Amino acid sequence: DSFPDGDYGA
Amino acid sequence: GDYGANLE
Amino acid sequence: TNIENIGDGAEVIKRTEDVSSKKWGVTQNVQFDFVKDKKYNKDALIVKMQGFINSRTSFSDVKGSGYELTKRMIWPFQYNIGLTTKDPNVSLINYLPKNKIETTDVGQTLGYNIGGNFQSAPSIGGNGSFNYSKTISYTQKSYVSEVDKQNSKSVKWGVKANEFVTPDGKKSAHDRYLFVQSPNGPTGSAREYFAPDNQLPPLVQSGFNPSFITTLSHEKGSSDTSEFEISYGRNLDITYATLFPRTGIYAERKHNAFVNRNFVVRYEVNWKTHEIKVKG
């Protein structure tokens, strides 16, 4: 939730 | 996946 | 609610909105000051954009065969701040900063005098000649501020990486080895392949606290409301560092790796009631 969709690729 | 978890 | 008499029959009606996004790592803390002056044929709304944009700096392993000794650092090459409108009844009549500024500290003032007279100075403290004034103040160590776009309907600033103090002297923001270092040993940790926090300036380590102004102009008697959007965000680069036991640390940069990672908020101004609402 505190990050964009995909979380930079994580 | 392509990358490990994001470290601060 | 917050009304200031500014002399000669004029007043300023002050509104604020605070809108954040934990997803985008942004807080927009915006001040909207309506200039209500019978001697000016237009309504004016001084919009001061403050808040916070997280750097979103991170460090991680790169998975897959051949990438076991490759690590990455994601970091903000530029902070994006902009305000745009498509409403025919509103135009932008000034913006601050108005020009490129490369000093670590930025401090400027917008002044208003009765009769629709705006003036800007790239300093704070100059003269007590204005009926009303608003200032901007921010720090951008190693970064520079540019006006990426400016016209009657939109303004966009970019606060962009420029030159960094490094143990081996000054390094350009385009140096592929910027922030790269040899780790102590082969014992993992993506973090160890990059410069420690004490070598990273605030815009890389933490984030940016914007402070920008633009004034919206509206003909009195045109429609009661206007919509506009404020966008805060960043463009991120990636620096990859690969450890080669016999030839050392090898670095590559993916420039503009994630562009326009922005939080956009749509606002509505009601010129008749002197109110601001967030649309979403």
Residue C97 belongs to domain with CATH number: 2.70.240.10
Strand partners, C106: C138
What's this structure's resolution in Å?
1.5
Longest dimension (CA), chain A: 15
Count how many residues are written for chain B: 8
C9 CB burial (10 A radius; 0-12, 13-18, 19+): exposed
φ, ψ at C191 (rounded to 5°): -55, -40
Domain interval for residue C131: 2-278
With an 8 Å Cβ cutoff, is A8 touching chain C?
yes
Angle at C23 between CA C18 and CA C25, to 5 degrees: 60
Sorted by sequence, the CB contacts under 8 Å of residue C85 that are 6+ apart come out as C91, C92, C153, C154, C216, C226, C227, C228, C229
Place of tokens 């040899």: C182
Phi-psi region of C199 (alpha: psi -120 to 50; beta: other; left: phi over 0): alpha
Angle at C9 between CA C4 and CA C13, to 5 degrees: 30
Chain A contact set for C25 (CB, 8 A): 2
CA distance C17 to C49: 10
Chain A contact set for C58 (CB, 8 A): 8
Strand order of the β-sheet with C117-121 is: C117-121, C105-113, C132-139
Q: Give the nearest chain A residue to B4 (CA atoms).
A: A10
Looking at the 3D structure of chain C, how many domains does it have?
A: 1
Q: Give the nearest chain C residue to B5 (CA atoms).
A: C60
Sorted by sequence, the CB contacts under 8 Å of residue A4 that are 6+ apart come out as C23, C24, C261
CA distance C257 to C195: 20
Say if residues C161 and C173 touch (Cβ distance below 8 Å): yes
CA distance C167 to C108: 33
CA distance C41 to C141: 41
Say if residues C270 and C223 touch (Cβ distance below 8 Å): no
Q: Where are the beta strands (DSSP E) in C140-211?
A: 143-150, 154-161, 163-166, 169-172, 207-208
Dihedral over Cα of C16, C158, C143, C189: its sign: positive
φ, ψ at C178 (rounded to 5°): -60, 125
First to last CA, chain B: 19
Say if residues C216 and C32 touch (Cβ distance below 8 Å): no
Q: Give the nearest chain B residue to C192 (CA atoms).
A: B7
Residue C65 exposure: Cα atoms within 13 Å on the Cβ side: 0
φ, ψ at C267 (rounded to 5°): -120, 155
CB contact under 8 A, B5 and C72: no
